[PDB]
Amino acid sequence: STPAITLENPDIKYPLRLIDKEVVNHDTRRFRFALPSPQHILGLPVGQHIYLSARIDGNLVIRPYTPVSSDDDKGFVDLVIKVYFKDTHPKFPAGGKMSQYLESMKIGDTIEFRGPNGLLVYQGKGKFAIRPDKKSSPVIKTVKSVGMIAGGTGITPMLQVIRAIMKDPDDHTVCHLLFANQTEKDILLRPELEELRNEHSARFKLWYTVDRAPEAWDYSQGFVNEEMIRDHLPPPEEEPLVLMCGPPPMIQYACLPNLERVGHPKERCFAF
Numbered sequence: 001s002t003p004a005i006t007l008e009n010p011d012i013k014y015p016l017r018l019i020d021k022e023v024v025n026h027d028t029r030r031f032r033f034a035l036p037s038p039q040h041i042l043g044l045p046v047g048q049h050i051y052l053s054a055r056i057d058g059n060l061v062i063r064p065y066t067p068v069s070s071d072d073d074k075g076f077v078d079l080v081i082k083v084y085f086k087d088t089h090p091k092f093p094a095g096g097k098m099s100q101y102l103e104s105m106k107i108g109d110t111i112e113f114r115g116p117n118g119l120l121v122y123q124g125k126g127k128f129a130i131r132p133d134k135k136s137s138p139v140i141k142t143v144k145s146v147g148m149i150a151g152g153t154g155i156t157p158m159l160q161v162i163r164a165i166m167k168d169p170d171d172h173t174v175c176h177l178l179f180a181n182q183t184e185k186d187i188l189l190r191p192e193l194e195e196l197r198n199e200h201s202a203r204f205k206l207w208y209t210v211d212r213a214p215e216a217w218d219y220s221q222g223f224v225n226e227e228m229i230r231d232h233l234p235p236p237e238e239e240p241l242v243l244m245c246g247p248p249p250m251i252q253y254a255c256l257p258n259l260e261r262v263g264h265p266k267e268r269c270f271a272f
């Protein structure tokens with residue numbers, strides 16, 4: 001038998017009840033929501049995400065999230081969230097709408113989930129099914145390695161794929177992650193990533209860059225650039241799939257031009 005799924009229809013919103021909130025650090029949370037029963041699973045294919053939607057101060061706000069739970073978890077879904085507080089970053093004085101709304105929720109409040117969504121699904125053993133658009137059929141391709149470039153909150157789509165690969169001992173796909181952040185303190189999910197490196201270093205390569213570095217720093221400083229892509233992603237000769245998720249100036253200026261300078265086919269670099 002298989003467990004009942006929560007996300008039965010992508011066109012339906014499912015209000016899920018908040019049952020636990022962990023303060024991971026000053027501006028990081030883990031939110032656990034109950035599924036419809038303790039025996040349900042979410043029903044989120046690897047590669048896909050959900051949306052949260054809410055009326056936030058009277059206006060509709062919809063944002064995508066990739067849980068840190070998986071379909072192996074029964075009864076709950078966990079989201080790790082970076083809270084963007086107002087009056088902290090000079091370019092974003094209002095902070096972030098959905099992340100501050102999540103931070104204001106009380107235990108027992110509900111929020112609407114919808115899914116699954118996304119043009120990419122990982123079918124296992126190196127094989128990705130990628131739609132060019134919703135309204136189009138998925139181009140499958142079995143790669144030997146995956147280059148992953150995440151910035152900030154773009155880590156969770158990568159982590160979901162990395163974990164799905166690592167937990168299959170017969171999946172020989174090698175993942176190379178280059179993870180960019182504003183500062184060391186702002187990095188999400190560092191213990192989780194380092195546990196994966198500890199356990200799976202032959203299939204999982206991990207590197208960080210930070211816009212500005214701490215005094216004691218073992219990794220890179222600056223935006224993603226050509227040299228970092230040469231040093232920390234598989235070479236284009238090996239035809240890796242390249243996955244990206246990060247802010248717009250990062251993808252547009254740091255990632256795509258430099259993936260091209262190295263020789264990866266730009267038009268095949270997938271952005272979540």
Ligand SMILES: Cc1cc2nc3c(=O)[nH]c(=O)nc-3n(C[C@H](O)[C@H](O)[C@H](O)COP(=O)(O)OP(=O)(O)OC[C@H]3O[C@@H](n4cnc5c(N)ncnc54)[C@H](O)[C@@H]3O)c2cc1C
Pocket residue numbers: 049063064065066067079080081082083084085086088089092094095096097098099100153154156157245247272
């Ligand atoms: C597939 C996918 C999966 C994702 N999964 C996750 C996830 O698991 N967890 C998660 O936290 N997010 C995730 N995100 C990002 C998420 O969709 C939102 O972008 C994020 O929650 C911020 O939304 P917001 O409404 O709070 O901010 P908005 O109101 O949309 O703010 C716009 C932008 O302003 C910037 N900003 C605002 N305030 C600050 C500040 N103080 N400091 C720095 N920058 C600031 C941020 O870059 C922010 O994205 C994911 C995105 C994608 C595409």
